[PDB]
Design a protein around this ligand. Structure first.
Ligand SMILES: Cc1ncc(COP(=O)(O)O)cc1O
Ligand SMILES: Cc1ncc(COP(=O)(O)O)cc1O
Ligand SMILES: [Cl-]
Ligand SMILES: [Cl-]
Ligand SMILES: [Cl-]
Ligand SMILES: [Cl-]
Ligand SMILES: [Cl-]
Ligand SMILES: [Cl-]
Ligand SMILES: [Cl-]
Ligand SMILES: [Mg+2]
Ligand SMILES: [Mg+2]
Ligand SMILES: [Mg+2]
Ligand SMILES: [Mg+2]
Ligand SMILES: [Mg+2]
Ligand SMILES: [Mg+2]
Ligand SMILES: [Mg+2]
Ligand SMILES: [Mg+2]
Ligand SMILES: [Mg+2]
Ligand SMILES: [Mg+2]
Ligand SMILES: [Mg+2]
Ligand SMILES: [Mg+2]
Ligand SMILES: [Mg+2]
Ligand SMILES: [Mg+2]
Ligand SMILES: [Mg+2]
Ligand SMILES: [Mg+2]
Ligand SMILES: [Mg+2]
Ligand SMILES: [Mg+2]
Ligand SMILES: [Mg+2]
Ligand SMILES: [Mg+2]
Lengths: 386, 386
């Protein structure tokens, strides 16, 4: 059994990750590759071991949010293509080329300036580039086919740069009204047709996130970007209710009870603000998770955890490192008992989706804000490591 | 100037931290020591550099949430006493003795088994222990006089343990109604006097958090635990509005504009869900921070950042690594312009307190959830460093 000083931990089930990759692979066209999106520490699951597992079981490439995230993966021994999805300052072009990290860009000046930097440095490696086309997300990317053509030309004239992809991002592919997604797809294809009409040969074309991969597998083109689905989580209730691909949640969050007491003497106030008053025979268990771990303070007097297969409520306010839960009057519980904060236990389950609904957010935020001070353990072929 | 691949960073002003320590020192009794509370990675400020600066300018001990947080400080060369405030499993008794970490405990069985472990190791040093007395927080600690005495007798009879402190925690000392705080203090004093009437000499007595140190400096006893106030933030608006101690916020959160564009062509949808539609001459700036950094998704269509001394609004949904803000109709701004997310710029300010109120939470949570993938820079004697 697990030995920790502070007994809170994450379990990432890599067998589920493999099953999730397999389900997406079996759904999308055979020719389409899979780019596993492991930005933000693998959506809080741990980027290194999720990326390693994905590449063993179906993925060809990786996506991250920054050069620094890509370098962490290279230092783990990973040789697969790694795309930075956001903006990379020209200050890191030299470093990105040396680590064989692929950068997104979409402006003539950036292309020309990056080339000149690598020229001046006598760079040993060329820098791989994907062009972002903004078709309605409004975040990053080139927005007109005229300007796109100039960006392509600047990239092609840059001998120290290497064009390896072109992509766009859907902003509402997880919604019931598909109008905007079809307009974006139509616009993207129009831009790509414009380039081909100029005789330009296209590199790897990718546009689908998890939502469009499930709902519009025919848009998979050369490659899709599998993010939330890799982790066994759906991009929206609507996509889940399509019932087209079966995903298995990979992440659980657990702890062991640090202390158990009956509230026999007064005062029976519990936690900050004294917002909860226990009964004289009520049993209160203290757990080593709090809002600095990413367990939202808005779950104060609201959240649930699983103990011995049953939902027991948070009592009083969440504190920075600890919560208290009620085991009820003369409730049964002991120090050391395992508690499930997100996940399954015996018959019961408190899913990340249910926590997100309670907090009026999305599963993406619940998992990707799990603090790095929580250790992560990995299950593969039914057994733990790391 | 700072050189980053992904241009988001934190600045922690250690001159402000020094001034905060002095203000608290100047307010509490001369004989009272300060234990600087640096749990949760220094409330998101960086535990190592804040601890180092505090021990140099008025603090003599440290508090953390876990043995693991104390080990981080020891590895950085910090030799001051470090108290673990939460529960430490018996499997970490030997390691805490080797690292000279002080643990909190409050149960006869824990004392006896911990001593038994060390006795079997023939440990060359006694493990330092503080006893937690639960006077109303209801989280950890012993709750009756008679069980406190049994716990003290077991600790004193454990030759491989060393009693070096006794404490309690106030649960409503930041609130206008002081009734519960006065009851907690009365009870703690009563328990300590009961121990003295048994012939027991007390070690270091501490009970004040920031709130009680400010509002009840007469409770400071041998030592206070300075947390939120060390970082220049008040435990509550009520405590701040007492106007008794001037604190200066230490943390700012900043970024540089990744891209600026005019929404000339259709569609003018911004970010996921297309919840924002820009005007044809509206300027949208994209910034490299998102909810995986700790910038709450609940600030979608609600938050503000500072650009050229002006508040500009978040436009559309917060995404995992990026947000978009509107510089207005015909707005002026350039890629690479510095933006302040939390903090001051020219005459403007977006305090952590204001962000917390928008989100129905507290400043503690806003800072302590700042992701470790944001690099932290420290200002000391008016100049930046590592
Ligand atoms: C540009 C980009 N592309 C793809 C993803 C993955 O999306 P999902 O998690 O919804 O699958 C994220 C992203 O920022
Ligand atoms: C036992 C204990 N003691 C003290 C603190 C610091 O409190 P403030 O930030 O309100 O100063 C925290 C804590 O858990
Ligand atoms: Cl650019
Ligand atoms: Cl984008
Ligand atoms: Cl609170
Ligand atoms: Cl983190
Ligand atoms: Cl115990
Ligand atoms: Cl406590
Ligand atoms: Cl969204
Ligand atoms: Mg287990
Ligand atoms: Mg099928
Ligand atoms: Mg390269
Ligand atoms: Mg332009
Ligand atoms: Mg080229
Ligand atoms: Mg082709
Ligand atoms: Mg249906
Ligand atoms: Mg399920
Ligand atoms: Mg109240
Ligand atoms: Mg009750
Ligand atoms: Mg959060
Ligand atoms: Mg600066
Ligand atoms: Mg007991
Ligand atoms: Mg002893
Ligand atoms: Mg004394
Ligand atoms: Mg007043
Ligand atoms: Mg101020
Ligand atoms: Mg809608
Ligand atoms: Mg508008
Ligand atoms: Mg608004």
């Amino acid at each position: 059994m697990i030995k920790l000083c502070r007994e809170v931990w994450i379990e990432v089930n890599l067998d589920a990750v493999k099953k999730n990759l397999r389900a997406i692979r079996r759904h999308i066209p055979h020719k389409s590759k899979i780019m596993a999106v492991v930005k933000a520490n693998g959506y809080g699951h741990g980027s290194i071991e999720v990326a390693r597992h994905a590449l063993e079981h179906g993925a060809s490439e990786l996506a991250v949010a920054s050069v620094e995230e890509g370098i962490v993966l290279r230092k783990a021994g990973i040789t697969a293509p790694i795309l930075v999805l956001g903006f990379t300052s020209l200050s890191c072009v030299k470093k990105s080329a040396a680590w064989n990290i692929t950068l997104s860009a979409f402006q003539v000046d950036w292309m020309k300036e990056a080339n000149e930097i690598l020229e001046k440095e006598a760079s040993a490696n060329r820098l791989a580039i994907h062009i972002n086309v903004d078709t309605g997300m409004g975040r990053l990317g080139v927005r007109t086919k005229e300007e796109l053509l100039e960006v392509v030309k600047a990239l092609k004239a840059s001998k120290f740069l290497r064009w390896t992809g072109i992509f766009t991002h859907f902003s509402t592919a997880d919604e019931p009204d598909t109008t905007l997604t079809k307009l974006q797809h139509e616009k993207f294809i129009s831009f790509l047709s414009f380039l081909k009409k100029q005789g330009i040969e296209l590199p790897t074309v990718h546009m689908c996130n998890t939502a469009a991969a499930i709902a519009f597998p025919e848009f998979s083109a050369d490659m899709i970007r599998l993010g939330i689905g890799l982790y066994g989580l759906y991009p929206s209730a609507y996509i889940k209710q399509l019932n087209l691909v079966k995903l298995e949640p990979a992440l659980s969050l657990k702890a062991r009870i640090a202390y158990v007491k009956t509230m026999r003497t007064e005062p029976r106030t519990v936690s900050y603000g004294a917002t909860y008053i226990a009964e004289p025979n009520e049993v209160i268990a203290t757990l080593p998770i709090g809002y600095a771990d990413g367990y939202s303070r808005a779950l104060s007097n609201r959240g649930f955890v699983l103990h011995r297969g049953k939902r027991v409520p948070v009592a009083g306010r969440v504190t920075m490192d600890m919560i208290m839960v009620s085991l009820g009057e003369n409730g049964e519980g002991k120090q050391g008992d395992e508690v499930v904060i997100y996940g399954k236990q015996k018959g019961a389950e408190i899913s990340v989706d249910e926590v997100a609904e309670m907090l009026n957010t999305i599963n993406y935020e619940v998992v990707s804000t799990l603090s790095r001070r929580i250790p992560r353990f990995y299950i593969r072929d039914g057994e733990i490591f790391k």
